Amino acid sequence: TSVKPIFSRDMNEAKRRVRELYRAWYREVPNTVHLFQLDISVKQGRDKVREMFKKNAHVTDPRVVDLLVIKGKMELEETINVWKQRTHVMRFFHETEAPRPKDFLSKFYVGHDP
Amino acid sequence: HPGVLRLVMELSGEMVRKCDPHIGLLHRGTEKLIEYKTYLQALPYFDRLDYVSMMCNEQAYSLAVEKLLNIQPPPRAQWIRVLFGEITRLLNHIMAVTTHALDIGAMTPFFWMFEEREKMFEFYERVSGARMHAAYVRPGGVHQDLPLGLMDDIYEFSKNFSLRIDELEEMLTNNRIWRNRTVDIGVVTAEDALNYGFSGVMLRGSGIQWDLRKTQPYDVYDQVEFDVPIGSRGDCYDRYLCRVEEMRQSIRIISQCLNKMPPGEIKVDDAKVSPPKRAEMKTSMESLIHHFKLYTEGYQVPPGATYTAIEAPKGEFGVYLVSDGSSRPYRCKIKAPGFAHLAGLDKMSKGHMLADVVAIIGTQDIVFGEVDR
Amino acid sequence: TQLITVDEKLDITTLTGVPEEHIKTRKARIFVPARNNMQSGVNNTKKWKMEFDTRERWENPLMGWASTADPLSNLVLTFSTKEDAIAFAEKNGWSYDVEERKVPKPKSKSYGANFSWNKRTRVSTK
Amino acid sequence: TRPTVRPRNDVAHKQLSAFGEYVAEILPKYVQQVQVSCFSELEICIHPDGVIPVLTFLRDHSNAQFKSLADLTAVDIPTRQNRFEIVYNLLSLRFNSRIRVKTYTDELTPVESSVSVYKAANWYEREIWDMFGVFFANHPDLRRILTDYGFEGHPFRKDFPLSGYVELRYDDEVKRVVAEPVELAQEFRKFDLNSPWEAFPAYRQPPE
Amino acid sequence: KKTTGLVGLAVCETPHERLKILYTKILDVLGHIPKNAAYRKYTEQITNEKLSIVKAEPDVKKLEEQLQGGQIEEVILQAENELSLARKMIQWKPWEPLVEEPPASQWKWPI
Amino acid sequence: ASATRLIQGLRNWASGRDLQAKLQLRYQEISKRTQPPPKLPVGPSHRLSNNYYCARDGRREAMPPSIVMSSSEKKAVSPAPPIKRWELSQDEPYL
Amino acid sequence: LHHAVIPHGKGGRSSVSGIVATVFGATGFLGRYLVNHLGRMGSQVIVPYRCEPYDTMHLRPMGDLGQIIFMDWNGRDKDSIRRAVEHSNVVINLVGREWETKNFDFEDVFVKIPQAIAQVSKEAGVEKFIHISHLNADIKSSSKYLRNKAVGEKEVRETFPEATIIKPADIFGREDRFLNYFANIKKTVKQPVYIVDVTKGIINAIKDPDARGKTFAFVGPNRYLLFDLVQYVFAVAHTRDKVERIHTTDRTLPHLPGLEDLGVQATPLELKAIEVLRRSEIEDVQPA
Amino acid sequence: TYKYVNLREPSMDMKSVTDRAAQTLLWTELIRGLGMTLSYLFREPATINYPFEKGPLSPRFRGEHALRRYPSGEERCIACKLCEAVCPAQAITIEAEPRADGSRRTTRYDIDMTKCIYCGFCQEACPVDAIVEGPNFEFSTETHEELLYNKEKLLNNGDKWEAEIAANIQADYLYR
Amino acid sequence: GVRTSPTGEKVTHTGQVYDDEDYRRVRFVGRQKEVNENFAIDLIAEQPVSQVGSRVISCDGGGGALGHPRVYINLDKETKTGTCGYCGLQFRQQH
Amino acid sequence: EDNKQFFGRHRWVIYTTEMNGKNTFWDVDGSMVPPEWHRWLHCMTDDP
Ligand SMILES: NC(=O)C1=CN([C@@H]2O[C@H](COP(=O)(O)OP(=O)(O)OC[C@H]3O[C@@H](n4cnc5c(N)ncnc54)[C@H](OP(=O)(O)O)[C@@H]3O)[C@@H](O)[C@H]2O)C=CC1
Ligand code: SF4
């Protein structure tokens, strides 16, 4: 069962890393949203960032949590650079619906999509 | 437009700081597609991952599969394959020379040597029937051999091409400001030549007496007679001179190949690997069956993980094959000499300005479709 | 060197980048493929193939093709034992249906009882 | 048996066999398998802890130099608890031979960042990180090469299908090129070619 | 000599005595190792063989061609990196017995 | 070619390479098309009475890669003999 | 019905949706955005263009292969129009010009065009005849343009009455006309709604039958003064019948079905104002 | 086997050093380069009159993807699916049905001219040489949809010529 | 032998001709529906039937390694003609 | 076909006007030579 982890000794260092990373994401919003010449309010993007953080909330093993910290760290590197353009920043947004809700009936009309 | 790359240069003014090549923009997923196909369909990918070396990588992939598959190719196919390796090396060196020359300046010699290369394109047409992506090479012998009435024209082309390359040395080559442009750019330590994984032409132009041909003759390269040039400075001017003498030794090998051609055979003596000729293919049952199941299923391949590498005109062209017992390759991988040469770009262009960075990118031959793997 | 490790399931399913629509919607099926009964080859056995369920493949209205909105309808994974299949499916998260491997039956045949004296086994022509 | 069959030799076979046995003797700590190919290219199957001792031993030691670093990819194989394979290829400069260090690993447990011994390792390492997902211990820079910046999923894996989940197209509504889910016009007809009857009986694994 | 073939390589004046005192430090650092490690035996064997080549060769080019490793400072860098691996293999204990086994069904290749 | 000799003297004076003989553009130098129809012999098989495929079966000769263990000795050998230091070939050397 | 019309799978990029739409005009603003929404939905668009093929050629790739078809027409002949509506499922008409020409008035394009195309629509036996118009286009005075459009409304209700006469307010967008007149250089009630609300309402009404016979009018969600709009467009940003229409009035008519009968969320001013106001001082007066 | 260059000294005699000084300060060999360029300027160039002259080619050139048929006979194909089996982009799509006359036929023969990498594999795989790599290279299509050939499209393509194709086959059936 | 659909456009030898309600009719507006004018059904009706008095006869289709390979068809039946699967041209017997 | 010029200026062609109603005195096209002249003029032979 002896498996080497990435960084941490319990989930406490993992929580430390991910909340420091989210603080960097929160302070990283206004400069880039003024620089990228965007059209979406700061509240909407910040709520989508915290909602994406809350999407992966069902993970308890600290190796995976530190790996997601490394993922978001690379993401915040490529957004503190001006490497990523308007395309990927809007690609985080989902404006191309695809309107299908979780109704059984809307799945009945547009069939074969359970 | 500053090959297409993205470059992020941190600099102090006209005397830099750092440089970051963003590459991979010409990515095509050839590894994944070969993982979903057959060998005979994977072969155009190995024709065009490097596209200037149209037949050398053909030779490398074919001899990779034949090295795996315990098949000696027939002798006349070996001589034809060495002939087109020399021809393809000549074309690749001359296009790298002309694109570096046009990247700095130098209008007309570019077009002189591209007229030469148009004669080369007509030669590829008259041999294969393609224009640039001549498949022409099966693992299991060179397929669809050359027609009659060509070799004396190749002889005339060899004389006039020796004259034109001597006239390129006349026009350029002790030009004043071209030399003054290229002396102090491209310096590579021999320890750095080893540790930074540079291959072929950089190892030629700096330091080690090395050749994959001379170390491992996998073909009739041992029997033909020549001598490789070595650089010693490295001093990109001298690397250019090494390229020119490699071209001239390739012309000598062309002369020895014209002198030493046996009229033996086209492909191997195996209709289980090579799809046989038309009279026996039609008019015979066994060849029809082997033809049919050979094109449908693909030829069976024994399992294992192999590797080979040839001396492509860019350098150590490596190919690593992984194959289950099947007619599909399990996983292929390509070691690119252009990617290897690009891997030390900080230590090359550390101490110059941006135009010299452009000249360093030019003086290492590149396609960025092989560099992409 | 015998570090922190905690023992659970694995969480590669958040890492593999496929959305939860195709996680919970599509379902995997793990079986040993059939002997192609026209031929007689059991060489296509000994391979636990993992597949998915096929979905809609409508007609291309200009060309008449199999126009499908299915990225995951063209995968097959080769496994050695059923344990590897179960560990892989629980590793990457989506649901699995494992069928049981059905081997052939070693059946007794004998030329003498084919051509015996008072039994009903008599081919009468060969 | 004589004509048109690829000639091999016992000389390079015996040399590489004795050398691999010699290396396995002088490093009893991480060697597992020393397999000599019939076409004389050595493979050595290795545990993933003393990778940097192995590389410092194989850069040097004056009986075989091997100053040339080459192909390395952790070739995607399922069915194994230790999936990925780090195969460092080493080519000599004085002795003209090719050895492969195939050390094993799984997905999560990291290998130990071979850039400390070889200068040409860095872009290879960053490539394997973006493509497979093999993490490194005290590594300088993990960025994304050969992929899109917004793309995820480590697409070389057998987890990843042929197509992606993104499809770029421009619209004038929101005035940019957006990524939509996939809309394939052609099936990608997967022509199954695995015919029976066991062409190579010598490579048959023993059944139950 | 004068302006040898290799690029990043400036020759010295006495490879003889410098290489001899390097090999004395090689034998001493090797003396910091237990005997039962046969690594000591193989290194000491090849080092004494090359040292006995060195101890009776006055000429330079004759040494470069009789003793292999052409031409000269490749042997010097070879000895330096041999000392580097000696210093690193005080650590890491490469002659130890086995670390824990692989699952042993992995390396069966056709799978 | 097909021009006056005065500009021929100009071309030979600006670059003394005898441009009339060697001019890189061919007029009737072409080995002409429509060859005789070729007749091709098969190589060293289809030769009857001898060539079993069991004789020429290189595909089945592939042994599995041989296995070595770890899963007062004249020793410490190299993977190869040392390669000879090369030579200036006589084909126009330097210096 | 016959096959190859029923929907299949998702939408967009040569998807098989349910509809086949013949659009009249479409070179300008709203028809081009509606072609883009149909390519987003993945239907087949029949567009006849009378202009140079360069325009339809650079708006060509908005769909996938097979998703579009181009043809040629004149605004005088019923034969080309009947050839356009040979096999047509639904049909929309978008028409409107800022100044008259030497060959066309505001009348007889708004009269002679919807008479002819509504005629061949009712003869072809199609559904969801959707004809656009303008808000408060009276039969009565103050605008030749609006009274001609009201005559067009009356004639569309006249021939084939099972239709959708659809009027928005003065809509704004990326290529708006009147706001471009405002930027590049009295009392007025006005409430502009943004273009995507209108065209989402159109695609909802054209994928939702039972809509035949009902007329629509769209509402801006703010209802404020034109002078404060000028204040805002210069705060950020740092013909005669056209200016008389935008200084006339723009009121609400709650007696015909509008927005929430269709069930669509309206979009505000400031978001799309910050969008198009390229090349934060938000007034937001909104009187009632 | 190594032949290295640039290892030669400049001579420290007054002669060669002032000859190199004359080269440096007097612009000699640059004018020699001018003379080389003028020597090639007074040539006659190797161009072609493009709408009137068409350059050299091969008898094995792989263009049009046209069909053949039998001498006073039926359609040459079989629908044996070898070309679809070997096409490296799956650009071939053959939906096949037999007609009631007994001779086996098709329904829909499909070549994606977008997806064709122009091998020759479908030529070398067809047993009757139904699909033939064509001789001429003039497609230049204005529209996207017209690059999707159908069966009767290829039949009318083969109905314009065969004698060119038969000449290339008659010159090229012996080397393969 | 092209016919005419009740819609008006030409039929194909493959029976895929349109209905009164198809919209590929309306995508064919303005341009040619490129149909073939050569029907291989009736060209075989143009072909005469050979009379060969032997028992088992060959077929190649006019050329050594040109056309379809050697297929040997049978003529032992009295009334059912020998039809080549490759040629499609029948044969008779003279006994 | 001239025997004076080099390889590439052996054969050339002069078309006519309105062979299918094009007013093609100016701006002539390709795809106009019948294919026996495609065999001739592309130098796939040495025969007229
Ligand atoms: N706030 C707004 O902008 C409002 C807009 N509208 C409607 O929005 C649509 C787009 O408006 P806008 O972009 O400003 O104007 P456009 O002229 O650009 O759009 C009208 C479309 O119909 C075509 N068309 C109009 N008149 C004729 C004619 N006489 N002959 C042939 N074609 C004609 C146009 O040009 P072409 O022929 O070249 O295709 C174009 O395709 C119009 O239908 C207009 O009535 C209505 C009310 C308010
Ligand atoms: S290979 Fe030839 S006969 Fe077979 S399906 Fe293709 S075109 Fe038809």
Ligand code: SF4
């Ligand atoms: S030449 Fe074209 S159609 Fe033929 S096999 Fe190659 S890609 Fe397919």
Ligand SMILES: [Zn+2]
């Ligand atoms: Zn026949």
